């Protein structure tokens, strides 16, 4: 008996050897990417044996075992259809029609707040999927960088809860939606911002991360933290929006000064500096692939799906998903929690960092926003997504009408 | 091969025949109860053949086989560990520990609004479980009748959505929590009550059920409905509470008139009569066992777990859980949604109607309310429950730290 | 070779005989209805031979031959997938999603002009399809009667051109849209109403049908036509609406008198009587199944698709479609012609008579009008339909980007 | 089995060889022209073997194969009568009678406003066809160059929507016909010109193409666009016409200043410069064969029929065909939309750029205009054409009286 041989004959045909063009397209059809970090060791050993004999792309029973032996447990669950979406290619084609049915919603206005965001083209539209098992798919402008803006608010909240714990973090920021009331107010009635997803609350959260060290070290700590959430995929920084958001942020300055008398920061806070750190964190750049992985990290209880590493404590992810449910889409949050039922977070660059817990993480991106600040195409996509699969938070995994459950086979 | 045979040797021990108490204790240890409605044919023939011969209580291979023949698909999931809680015996032992730690919380005040709820003892405390598969467990004062009071609000909202649909019903009622600055107002800014879980909204929803018939017919139409949600377990009516809620509903009479003014009911509504219907629906009686099956029907996508009949549409159940999530615990809702993450509804009688979607429904009952109107022991129980199992809506089903997952073996 | 046999083994499986439910579910899935008038002999002889032996139910090669013998030419085009939409099962599955996306549009207000249209519920919403070959599908409230109102204008225009020819009819009525300052004016500068689709023009056209005869026969002559256009499905008359349009038609009276000094009718016209006839023609009743067949006759060059009968001359059908293109949706006509590109007609009752030439006719109905008088749901549906298929008048039948073409296989 | 063999034997006679005149006249009778760009390799391989031995003009099955292998799938649908007009030879003979019945209509007066248009003879008259498959036919004066004038308005509108998209373009110009005495006003009540086919709208459209570059580069971008649209057939520039349109263009200046005041352009517009661009764009030269291919690109969903290239987005072609339907013939537009049912666009030079969607494009040219500005012969031809074939937009492709349908056998 052997796990490697059994997998060999499943791909082999009962034939003697496997061409390695056939092995990787068998692999790519599980949705995995040959660049998966949990597979380097297997593809490190395939570029090795694809120089030893440049003739015969072919692989014995025994040559197969020494390329895959290292990663075999992850490869067979991929090949025994044991990933969270077993027929991943069927699901991606649904992602495709979902992408392109959203593609003809030309409504919306791109943020003119800054010359750096009006800059971005209204025809950009990208959707990226990463499952809790690492299966990936993209369509549209999926590797164009854009800034997270307020899509970083759950990520910095998670970091704060991860390092400091729920109870401390919420001495300083609430945990409830304000109400379609106070788009306008900074503080709840305990003189705390309502929740980490609104600018007043985000700024307070930003004040908590890595106290006692300067703002350059603090920023690097969030960036290496954000690196782990993304499996070390792309996360950058556009100094252009950063310097443009510091010239044009009188209300963050309004909020900041509002927080000082009201003694909403912890002792020793340099508010004007924290405003700079906040402006930096909102100009962090990602793609939808990058961001989809961080989404999937939250989809996966704090484990990065493409590295297997523990990034965020489960307590941090639960809280972060809790509040993205209720507060994550500006004024549209309650409507969104009702009709979509997914923890999501939107940003002025056109991003929606969407999380389907226990299934997949996603990132949508189209710069045209509606009049509540949400990517028009993005909102459309998530409505269609829940309208077609039982990813809604309170769909039943047993009785779900004419919806699909991509989590199951036949 | 034939299931009744396969199941026969599973209990048989490899022995000759199965005594019927050995079969009955094996079944009850799966958590099913011999009175299960989906088991009635099987238990009708065990009582019959234990009259056909008053000696030897043992069961041949066909004597067993033609007693379970009608019900075999359910008995096998029961005996093959295929229910959603496979190790139900330890899970109830946890419910017991959970029950008894809430039992030493002597705080709270019993609602003295009317002599009928001040009548109730502060030492009454009951918790009842019913799973999406029909498994039951109770502890404490579990068959004492009490009125749902506002535990009926999700149930009548579901009924309304089932017959009229989301889009119609929500012409008349909102779908968001007010904000804990608006426990006080009746209407949001589209002049709709904020959501079905608050008195103004329940009252509007009640105005929608079964228009065109008188209040006696409406009441029975809702009552037959609650019978189906409860698998025909106890659903009653306390006329004592109803007549006393007719004296002391100046706020409801306030709300009713405020709503008729603002053109909030559908045309042709007799508001004062709807108020009478509303007081009726709030004085409908249950026990925790009755009501736990009621909750399990929403846990189960609208199928009553102990009868298999479809009671509520999936759209009705999803919306009802969506709004119990955010609006279900009066002012404690946002705190509840954060710390417990379970769709729940409380009532001034001491009830909390709790739903763990895809797993189980429950009803806890202790009349002493805290200063926000929620059962003290109930609130204590629900916090302990999710701190011990990954039932929180945004717990991860794969990575959940030191919590238990009763959905899996060990 | 023989045509009945060839169709026999195509369904037969090569097997036995054909169960007659298997023949009829095969027939219905082409979209035909067993009630089709061109199939009456086949279903008469199938109901007959399912009495000749009450106990079959199967079909010999010679028994199949004598049930389909009279109808074989139509059944083969149905079974050789030679109808204008070959995969009708796909297309109706799309129509359903189109219907359900329009169902969530709660905007609009029902015409309260007369108590007869305010009666109608805002949640009535029906869509019905009939192809140039007779294939049908409906969804929603498709056999609820409503009056054509101004959906009759294209039809009476067609009747007029069919009997009198283009050149005579347009002595009295123009053939161009007014332009959106002239919603308000009755006559162009040749002292003719602008076109047959606006009230002044219809009223003049009403004056041309069946001159020299009294109003009872005139109405009856139009009713014979509309029965023929609908294959004798439901077309009725609402005396309720007619008398209320008799009370509240000061404008048609205003218009009627304005048309009389300017000598706009033919000699010998009794203007007030013509106004009465026009009021009758507007309160004629249909359902969307009924009316969808009327649209399909215009889609089909004047032949009723479900009877094969020639109803309108090609000249009448072309002109009526020419003018529904530009003038058919009130103030929205030019926008509708741009974004939808289909000959359509709207009515105050909530109807939209839509024609996809050479393909199919449809009738959408939801009584809520927008602020220009067009069914909100109808307008929404018509956008999504063309946004989904290459039916736009000026889509290309070869290069049409990511749109669907139901005229094509795969 | 092999297609070059099959096509060889369908042409061959069943004899062993084909004279290559028999192959060329058989090819021209499908209506394709040996100059078709999609046949270039094929004619490269017979320009070559028509030197290997200069007499003995005949072709084996393997020699035939090595010239047509490169172009084989386009050549058989040509020879298996699978083009959208299978019997092109009768259709062109119908186009001929339509040409000659229209040629006897001398009504009209040549545009006399500028000397360069007075220059043109009243008896010049050309009609050229190009089908969605590349079949070509002409009659009369079909590569005498003349300016598009206002026949360019759909093309610059197509370019605009192709690069910028429908929603942007129609921020600045409407999408409906004005009303028959609103020929005189420049703006509707949203302060946009009514549509891209009227001068105010065209002038605004001209303001949208290729912003941020100077007017020499702008003009070159449009001509690269028109080159692709015509499959690189004739497109020129009459500097004579351009100088008469600038000396004598007071309404455009009126329009330009009226639009600038009402802020009808996008920010950063140089109005007097855009008027200059608009005047040159209107002096672009074509022939009827040239333009008929441009028409055929619009008949064909934005793909040029003689090169296979994707030129215009499908969204762009639909909108342009939409608006040529309702707004394309000046005051005669509504009448034309009723009786002809074809998207057409007329110009002061005497052109009518006509499109039969999914079938063919054509360009008519006779300089005598009627009293609404449309070529008399062009208008006559467009009436007779639909009077003969079910090309009317709302003709039925199934029940169509005695009109003939060249699309079927
Ligand atoms: O003008 C409108 C419009 C309007 C609409 C309908 C009716 C009337 C007016 N809206 C404004 N929004 N913000 C404004 O000014 C500043 C920025 C936000 N600031 C606040 N944060 N938190 C607050 N409240 C408490 O903290 C309660 C509290 C609870 C317990 C103790 C102390 C205070 S105010 C102050 S003005
Ligand atoms: O007890 C206090 C204490 C208090 C605390 C701090 C300062 C002093 C006093 N305050 C009261 N709260 N409620 C009261 O009773 C009234 C009956 C119901 N009323 C309303 N319901 N819903 C509404 N909706 C809109 O108003 C939206 C809307 C609609 C159109 C435009 C704008 C907004 S009004 C209010 S008294």
DSSP states of C58-126 as a string? ---HHHHHHHHGGGHHHHHHHHTT-SSSS-HHHHHHHHHHHHHHHHT----B---SSHHHHTS-TT--E
Tell me how far CA of residue B409 lies from CA of B7, B83, B91, B130, D365, in angstroms.
20, 11, 11, 19, 86
Alpha-carbon gap, residue A227 to A291, rounded angstroms: 10
Strand partners, B346: B352
Is A192:A172 a contact under the CB 8 Å cutoff?
A: yes
- How many alpha carbons lie under 13 Å from residue A30 in its C-beta half-sphere? 23
Strand partners, D379: none
Alpha-carbon gap, residue A230 to A291, rounded angstroms: 7
Alpha-carbon gap, residue D189 to A339, rounded angstroms: 38
Chain Cα centroid distance, residue A396 = 24
Q: Inform me whether the C-beta atom of residue A121 falls under 8 Å from chain D C-beta atoms.
A: no
Same domain, B290 and B348: yes
- D284 by DSSP, 3-state: which? strand
Same domain, B315 and B247: yes
- Using CA atoms of A14, A20, A22, A24 in order, give the dihedral in degrees to the nearest 10: 120
Ligand closest to Cα of A187 equals 1
Same domain, A89 and A211: yes
Alpha-carbon gap, residue C314 to D390, rounded angstroms: 11
Is A6:A74 a contact under the CB 8 Å cutoff?
A: no
| CA of A254, closest atom in ligand 1 | 17
> Would you tell me how many other CB atoms lie within 10 Å of the CB of residue A244?
18
> Would you tell me how many other CB atoms lie within 10 Å of the CB of residue C32?
23
Same domain, D144 and D63: no
Is A320:A298 a contact under the CB 8 Å cutoff?
A: yes
Q: Inform me whether the C-beta atom of residue B408 falls under 8 Å from chain C C-beta atoms.
A: no
Tell me how far CA of residue A12 lies from CA of A17, A39, A49, A68, A78, in angstroms.
6, 20, 18, 14, 16
Tokens in use for B239? 């006329």
Is C277:C266 a contact under the CB 8 Å cutoff?
A: no
Any idea which residue has 């602020």 for tokens?
Answer: C371
Candidate from A181, A396, A401 with C-beta closest to B357: A396
Alpha-carbon gap, residue C343 to C155, rounded angstroms: 13
- B7 by DSSP, 3-state: which? helix
Interval between CA A188 and ligand 1 midpoint (Å): 10
Name the neighbours of A, counting chains with at least 3 Cβ pairs within 8 A.
B, D
Any idea which residue has 């026009």 for tokens?
Answer: C278
* Contact partners, residue D79, CB within 8 Å, separation at least 6: D7, D10, D11, D26, D27, D30
Ligand 2 probe mutation, B178, B179, B184, most atoms within 8 A of CB: B184
Alpha-carbon gap, residue D178 to D168, rounded angstroms: 21
Chain Cα centroid distance, residue B299 = 8
Query: Hey, CA dihedral for A393, A397, A398, A400, is it positive or negative?
Result: positive
Interval between CA D322 and ligand 2 midpoint (Å): 53
Chain Cα centroid distance, residue C193 = 25
Same domain, C86 and C75: no
* Contact partners, residue C375, CB within 8 Å, separation at least 6: C108, C346, C350, C351, C352, C364, C365, C366, C367, C368, C369
Alpha-carbon gap, residue C53 to D263, rounded angstroms: 83
C26: closest CA of chain D, how far (Å): 26
Alpha-carbon gap, residue C196 to A342, rounded angstroms: 52
Is A113:A64 a contact under the CB 8 Å cutoff?
A: no
Strand partners, D363: D128, D353
Selection from C353, C325, C349 nearest residue C110 by Cα: C349
- How many alpha carbons lie under 13 Å from residue A389 in its C-beta half-sphere? 19
Alpha-carbon gap, residue B19 to B46, rounded angstroms: 11
Tokens in use for D95? 């186009």
Ligand closest to Cα of A194 equals 1
Alpha-carbon gap, residue B223 to B235, rounded angstroms: 8
**C349: preceding bond cis by omega (within 30 degrees):** no
The 3-state DSSP composition of chain B as helix, strand, coil percent (nearest 5) reads 50, 10, 40
* Contact partners, residue C118, CB within 8 Å, separation at least 6: C110, C111, C112
Kindly report the backbone phi and psi dihedral angles of residue B145, in degrees, each rounded to the nearest multiple of 5, phi listed first.
-75, 145
> Would you tell me how many other CB atoms lie within 10 Å of the CB of residue C358?
17
Give me the number of domains chain D comprises: 2
Is A362:A379 a contact under the CB 8 Å cutoff?
A: no
Same domain, C131 and C269: yes
Alpha-carbon gap, residue D40 to D67, rounded angstroms: 10
Tokens in use for D323? 């608006």
* Contact partners, residue C166, CB within 8 Å, separation at least 6: C315, C319
Whether B4 has a binding-site annotation, put simply, is no
- A355 by DSSP, 3-state: which? strand
Same domain, B87 and B74: no
Is D237:D146 a contact under the CB 8 Å cutoff?
A: no
Strand partners, B58: B19
- Domain end, chosen from A52, A81, A110, is at A81
Selection from D110, D113, D114, D139 nearest residue D123 by Cα: D110
Tokens in use for B378? 């109930």
- Domain end, chosen from A50, A66, A81, is at A81
- C203 by DSSP, 3-state: which? helix
Is B255:B278 a contact under the CB 8 Å cutoff?
A: no
Same domain, D44 and D167: no
| Concatenated DSSP letters of C277-333 | HHHHHHTEEE-HHHHHHHHHHHHTTTB-TTT--B-S-HHHHHHHHHHHHHHTTGGGH
- Domain end, chosen from C81, C111, C128, is at C81
Same domain, A131 and A210: yes
Interval between CA B323 and ligand 2 midpoint (Å): 23
Residue of A nearest to D166 (CA): A106
Strand partners, B130: B136, B361
Q: Inform me whether the C-beta atom of residue C395 falls under 8 Å from chain D C-beta atoms.
A: yes
* Helix pair A72-79, A20-28: axis angle to 10 deg: 70
**Which of C179, C390, C397 to mutate: most D Cβ within 10 Å?**
C179
Helix (H) or strand (E) holding B195: none
Cα angle at B157 between B320 and B192, to 5 degrees?
100
Is B125:B365 a contact under the CB 8 Å cutoff?
A: yes
Resolution of the experimentally solved model in angstroms: 2.8
Alpha-carbon gap, residue C353 to C229, rounded angstroms: 13
The 3-state DSSP composition of chain D as helix, strand, coil percent (nearest 5) reads 50, 10, 40
| Concatenated DSSP letters of D86-119 | S-HHHHHHHHHHHHHHHHT---SEE--SSHHHHT
Interval between CA C20 and ligand 1 midpoint (Å): 74
Interval between CA B198 and ligand 2 midpoint (Å): 15
Same domain, D279 and D294: yes
Alpha-carbon gap, residue C163 to C167, rounded angstroms: 11
The separation between the first and the last C-alpha atoms of chain D, rounded to the nearest angstrom, is 27
Alpha-carbon gap, residue B262 to C224, rounded angstroms: 50
Same domain, A188 and A257: yes
Alpha-carbon gap, residue D253 to D261, rounded angstroms: 12
- How many alpha carbons lie under 13 Å from residue A393 in its C-beta half-sphere? 36
Selection from D181, D226, D172 nearest residue D202 by Cα: D172
Query: Hey, CA dihedral for D372, D376, D382, D385, is it positive or negative?
Result: positive
List chain A residues with CB under 8 Å of B83.
none
* Helix pair C3-12, C20-28: axis angle to 10 deg: 100
Is A117:A367 a contact under the CB 8 Å cutoff?
A: yes
Phi-psi map region of A309: left, alpha, beta (phi>0 left; psi -120 to 50 alpha): beta
* Helix pair C88-103, C376-388: axis angle to 10 deg: 140
Is A185 near ligand 1, meaning CB less than 6 Å away? Answer: yes
**Which of D163, D166, D167, D315 to mutate: most A Cβ within 10 Å?**
D167
- B303 by DSSP, 3-state: which? strand
> Burial level of D162, CB count in 10 A (0-12/13-18/19+)?
buried
Selection from B245, B238, B210 nearest residue B224 by Cα: B210
Is D187:D261 a contact under the CB 8 Å cutoff?
A: no
Any idea which residue has 């000046």 for tokens?
Answer: D330
- D405 by DSSP, 3-state: which? coil
> Which residue lies with its CA nearest to atom 10 of ligand 1?
A184
Domain that holds residue B347: 82-410
Candidate from B188, B322, B395 with C-beta closest to A394: B322
Is D115:D279 a contact under the CB 8 Å cutoff?
A: no
Instruction: Report strand pairing: D126-131 vs D360-365.
Output: antiparallel
Is C7:C18 a contact under the CB 8 Å cutoff?
A: no
Taking the CA atoms of chain D, what radius of gyration do you get in angstroms?
A: 23
Name the neighbours of D, counting chains with at least 3 Cβ pairs within 8 A.
A, C
Is C405:C389 a contact under the CB 8 Å cutoff?
A: yes
Selection from C11, C20, C34 nearest residue C80 by Cα: C11
Selection from A344, A347, A329 nearest residue A147 by Cα: A347
Phi-psi map region of D147: left, alpha, beta (phi>0 left; psi -120 to 50 alpha): beta
Helix (H) or strand (E) holding D276: helix D271-282
Q: Per residue, what are the HEC states of D184-253?
A: CCCCCCCCCCCCCCCHHHHHHHHHHCCCCCCHHHHHHHHHHHHHHHCCCCCEEECHHHHHHHHHCCHHHH
| CA of B189, closest atom in ligand 2 | 27
Ligand closest to Cα of B264 equals 2
Alpha-carbon gap, residue A347 to B291, rounded angstroms: 43
> Would you tell me how many other CB atoms lie within 10 Å of the CB of residue D69?
15
Q: Inform me whether the C-beta atom of residue C314 falls under 8 Å from chain D C-beta atoms.
A: yes
- A284 by DSSP, 3-state: which? strand
Selection from C221, C199, C334 nearest residue C278 by Cα: C199
Is B89:B26 a contact under the CB 8 Å cutoff?
A: no
Tokens in use for A140? 């549209």
Query: What single-letter DSSP state applies at residue A15?
Result: S
Selection from A373, A343, D250, A123 nearest residue B325 by Cα: A343
* Contact partners, residue B138, CB within 8 Å, separation at least 6: B126, B127, B128, B129, B288, B289, B292
Cα angle at B210 between B207 and B215, to 5 degrees?
75
Selection from A62, A115, A381 nearest residue A240 by Cα: A115
Tokens in use for C291? 């009316």
Kindly report the backbone phi and psi dihedral angles of residue D335, in degrees, each rounded to the nearest multiple of 5, phi listed first.
-65, -40
Selection from D408, D286, D305 nearest residue D361 by Cα: D305
The separation between the first and the last C-alpha atoms of chain A, rounded to the nearest angstrom, is 29
Alpha-carbon gap, residue A283 to C285, rounded angstroms: 62
Query: For residues A183-195, b (16+ Cβ closer than 10 Å) or e, as one string?
Result: eebbbbeeebbbb
Kindly report the backbone phi and psi dihedral angles of residue D141, in degrees, each rounded to the nearest multiple of 5, phi listed first.
-85, 70
* Contact partners, residue D159, CB within 8 Å, separation at least 6: D209, D222, D225, D312, D316
Strand partners, D386: none
Instruction: Report strand pairing: D126-131 vs D136-140.
Output: antiparallel
- D399 by DSSP, 3-state: which? coil
Same domain, C102 and C57: no
> Would you tell me how many other CB atoms lie within 10 Å of the CB of residue B367?
25
Kindly report the backbone phi and psi dihedral angles of residue C125, in degrees, each rounded to the nearest multiple of 5, phi listed first.
-160, 110
Helix (H) or strand (E) holding A88: helix A88-103
Is C70:C42 a contact under the CB 8 Å cutoff?
A: yes
Alpha-carbon gap, residue D225 to D236, rounded angstroms: 13
List own/partner pairs for A167-172 with CB under 8 A and 24 or more apart.
A168/A208, A169/A196, A169/A205, A169/A208, A172/A204, A172/A205, A172/A207, A172/A208, A172/A264, A172/A265, A172/A266
């Amino acid at each position: 008996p052997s796990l490697e041989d059994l997998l060999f004959y499943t791909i082999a045909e009962g034939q003697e050897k496997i061409p390695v063009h056939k092995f990787i397209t068998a692999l790519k059809s599980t949705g995995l990417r040959t660049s998966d970090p949990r597979l380097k060791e297997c593809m490190d050993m395939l570029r090795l044996t694809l120089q030893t004999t440049s003739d015969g792309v072919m692989l014995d029973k025994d040559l197969f075992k020494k390329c895959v032996q290292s990663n075999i447990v992850l490869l067979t669950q991929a090949f025994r259809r044991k990933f969270v979406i077993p027929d991943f290619m069927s699901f991606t084609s649904h992602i495709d029609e979902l992408y392109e049915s959203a593609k003809k919603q030309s409504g919306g206005k791109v943020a003119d707040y800054i010359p750096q965001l009006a800059k971005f083209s209204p025809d950009l539209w990208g959707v990226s999927v990463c499952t809790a098992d690492g299966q990936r798919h993209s369509t549209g402008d999926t590797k164009v960088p854009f800034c997270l803006q307020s899509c970083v608010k759950p990520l910095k909240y998670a970091i704060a809860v991860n390092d400091l714990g729920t109870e401390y973090v919420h001495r300083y920021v609430g945990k409830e939606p304000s109400g379609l009331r106070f788009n306008k107010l900074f503080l709840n009635e305990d003189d705390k911002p309502h929740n980490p997803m609104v600018n007043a609350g985000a700024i307070v959260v930003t004040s908590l991360i890595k106290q006692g060290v300067n703002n350059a070290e603090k920023f690097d700590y969030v960036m290496q933290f954000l690196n782990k959430m993304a499996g070390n995929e792309y996360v950058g920084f556009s100094n252009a929006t950063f310097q443009s958001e510091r010239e044009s942020g009188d209300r963050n300055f309004a909020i900041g000064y509002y927080l000082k008398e009201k003694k909403c920061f912890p002792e020793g806070t340099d508010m004007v500096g924290i405003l700079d750190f906040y402006f930096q964190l909102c100009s962090i750049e990602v793609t939808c692939e990058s961001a989809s992985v961080m989404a999937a990290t939250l989809a996966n209880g704090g484990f990065c799906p493409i590295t297997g590493e523990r990034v965020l404590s489960p307590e941090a992810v639960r809280n972060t998903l809790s509040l993205m449910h209720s507060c994550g889409m500006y004024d549209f949050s309650g409507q969104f929690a009702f009709h979509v039922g997914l923890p999501a977070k939107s940003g002025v660059a056109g991003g929606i960092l969407l999380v389907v817990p226990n299934v997949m993480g996603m990132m949508c991106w189209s710069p045209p926003l509606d009049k509540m600040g949400n990517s028009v195409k993005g909102i459309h996509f998530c409505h269609d997504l829940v309208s077609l699969c039982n990813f809604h938070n309170y769909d039943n995994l047993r009785h779900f009408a004419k919806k699909l459950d991509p989590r199951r086979e036949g």
